[model samples]
Target: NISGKFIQIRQIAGLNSSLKSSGTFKLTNDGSLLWQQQSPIKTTMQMSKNKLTQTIMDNPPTVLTRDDQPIVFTFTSVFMSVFKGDTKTISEFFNINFDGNTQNWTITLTPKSSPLNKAIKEIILKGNRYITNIDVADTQDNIIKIELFDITTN
Candidate 1:
């Protein structure tokens, strides 16, 4: 299991401004991820296996299942695979460029599958013992950059 505080910057294609948000995140070895967004609004997103549940403010929880949105499910699974160190699963869909050593390492992933490539151009992950940064460069020139700190794992 791993837990951390994160800051994310998102630049949407065609938008001149970027959006920044901060949150706390936790991912368990069982593939459950809980994200608690503290800024802009109080929101939470929890994803596990084939389901994703999201709640904002006092509103009703919104749910989505793998069968309902395969793309979303696939991406979430990729993230789970990443933190879980499931290299075999990651290599199945991406052409990887791995570098560095146990002290510090970086993995660059370029989508090899059609569906994945359609939305993502590349994904870069960097860390020492745990993931410190994730940068996603998408097809439309949008970017999502996340920096993780105050990390603890068990």
Candidate 2:
């Protein structure tokens, strides 16, 4: 299991301001992910194979499956694979450019398939043993920047 705290910044090209949030995330080796946002508002997202469940505060959960939301599911799969350091699966989705050594590395990826390519322009990952940062740039000129800290694994 791996756990960490994260800070995220989302910026829209035309917007004058960006949205910032903080959260905690727990990831299991099997690829399950639990993300809990602790700041600005309370929200949670749990991802498992074939399903993605989202909850906001005391509201009822919204569940999505691979069959019904293929694009979201596919994106979630790639995100989880990135968290797990599963390069083999990541390679299948993006054209990868990897650099640096084990102690410090960066990976730049561009989507290879139509579904992802049309939506995302690039994905950049930076870290050593565990990913410490992720940046996603979309075709709409939106950028999502995430920074991970105090990561522990068992």
Candidate 3:
């Protein structure tokens, strides 16, 4: 399981707002992930290669579909890459560049596909053994920042 805090910024249509929250996420080697938040409010986003589902409290599972939330599907794909830690997989969707040494590095990714590019601008990851921060920029105004700290194996 991976735990972290995230700051979400939505600047859509000039109605911008920033939301900060913390959570622990369970991730599978093949990209099945469940990100459950613990503060500000509770929410869960479960993701896989084929689908994404979000739940608030015990309400209902709101599936993010290509026909519905096309932007979200691709957006989550980028977010999941951080936990996947497999550049080979990520390289399929993005053009990746590295800055700094292996001991302290930053990985910057730009979407390579057209649809993804329309929804996401860039994703920057900074860290050493485990990721410390994630800066995500959507095509326009949405920006997501995730910060991770105090990680360990289970």
Candidate 4:
């Protein structure tokens, strides 16, 4: 089981409204993830290997994927990659540059798959004993920053 606090910052090209949100997140080794927000508003995003579910208050789980792309898919893919640490699957989509030492480590993913290349420019992951942060910078200049704490994996 993994639990942590997260802060997500989103910026659009022409919009002055940069959205900032804070939340608590949990992920289990069985590929289950729960995102619980406690700031600004209460929200929840629960994802597993087969489904993506998200809700806010009494609202239905209906929202547009990012600019017509499967935004949740992106999140699921990244988490799966990190969670499994499967090199073969990773190499299929990214040209991975991995470097590290006993104290610190980093993995840099450059998209090699054409579909992914069109959307994601780079994915950078940094950590020591556990993944501390994940940064994804997409072609649209949209950046997603994720930080994990109190994290445990089996």
Candidate 5:
């Protein structure tokens, strides 16, 4: 059972080098989620009952509806699943293989699934006793790396 809130730092890379951002994540018992980034840049994304709102600093929030592209939903859904113990949901969208004994997991996502998939190609998770690092590679060969300084679960 995944509960409580945690912090995450994501380093996103696109056509350029990686950029880092840190944020807080809260998952409710109802499966709703709230994610807010506070460093490097400020952004807030919240999801409840399949509805999503993404707001960037100095900008109004945008509501994502079911009619919208799957990319938006994919992102929110993935995280929700991860925190909810539905790791299989993520594995369905990506090829996931883990070496738990070595504290390593490799995931390769398909670019053909949806826009979200097109945005990333592979992900590597490395850690000892806990997940501490995440490396993401896009189809363009750009890599985004994320290092987690702390992870709290309840």
Candidate 6:
């Protein structure tokens, strides 16, 4: 089991845009997990147990809740496992292939009987310890990229 919070400096290379933020994550010994991201600019995303919440830092926190499909949260769980060296747990969630020599890894996660899986095309995790770049793409072709930096283990 792995647990820690990481600060991420994210950039959409294709769009040449960048942002910095902080995230806290907790992964239980039993494999359950929670992740929360708070941007300096006031946007927040939190996934707890099986619930996912995204709030924009507007008046009263404009929020979106997902109780049935916790896609982002599930992906963070997989990420915590990977960062903690729980290779088996990581593989259980995604089809992971690594190129140690190249120091890059590709992970493809398909929803295994979940409606949320239908919406996700695939997620790619690249880079090494301390810095991992994450790219999430959906069936509709929308993509979100996150670059995790300064990862500290607990």
Best by TM-score: 2
Candidate 2 local lDDT, 10-73, one digit each (tens): 9999999999999999889887999899999999989976669989998999997656665456
Looking at candidate 4, the ten consecutive residues that score lowest on lDDT are 62-71
Better of 4 and 6 by TM-score: 4
lDDT of each residue in 84-115, candidate 3, tens digit only: 66677789988999999868999999889887
Give the winner by TM-score: 1 or 5: 1
Q: Which stretches of candidate 5 lie over 4 Å from their true place?
A: 1-18, 65-73, 102-117, 127-131
Q: Estimate each model's TM-score.
A: 0.89, 0.90, 0.80, 0.81, 0.66, 0.56
CA RMSD for every model? 2.0, 2.0, 2.6, 2.8, 4.1, 5.2
What TM-score does candidate 2 reach? 0.90
Candidate 6 structure quality by residue, lDDT tens digits, 1-154:
3445556554445556556677765555554555556557555555445544556666454334445445556566656566556777655545665655446555555544456567666777776554367777766656667665545555
Compose the digit string of candidate 1's lDDT tens values, residues 68-112.
655455556666788888989988888989999988999999989
Error of 2 at 101 (Å): 0.8
Give the C-alpha lDDT of model 1. 0.84
Q: How accurate is candidate 4 locally (lDDT)?
A: 0.75
The lDDT of model 5 is 0.62
Cα lDDT listed for each candidate? 0.84, 0.85, 0.74, 0.75, 0.62, 0.59
Question: What is the descending lDDT order?
Answer: 2, 1, 4, 3, 5, 6
In candidate 3, stretches whose alpha carbon ends up further than 4 angstroms from where it belongs are: 1-13
Give Cα distance to truth, residue 138, candidate 2, Å.
0.4
Over 4 Å off, model 2: 65-75
**lDDT minimum window of 10 residues, candidate 5:** 1-10
Query: On TM-score, who's better, 2 or 4?
Result: 2
Candidate 4 stretches greater than 4 Å from native:
13-18, 62-69, 152-154
- Displacement of residue 94 (Cα, Å) in model 1 is 1.2
lDDT minimum window of 10 residues, candidate 1: 66-75
The per-candidate count of clashes, in order, stands at: 0, 0, 0, 0, 0, 0
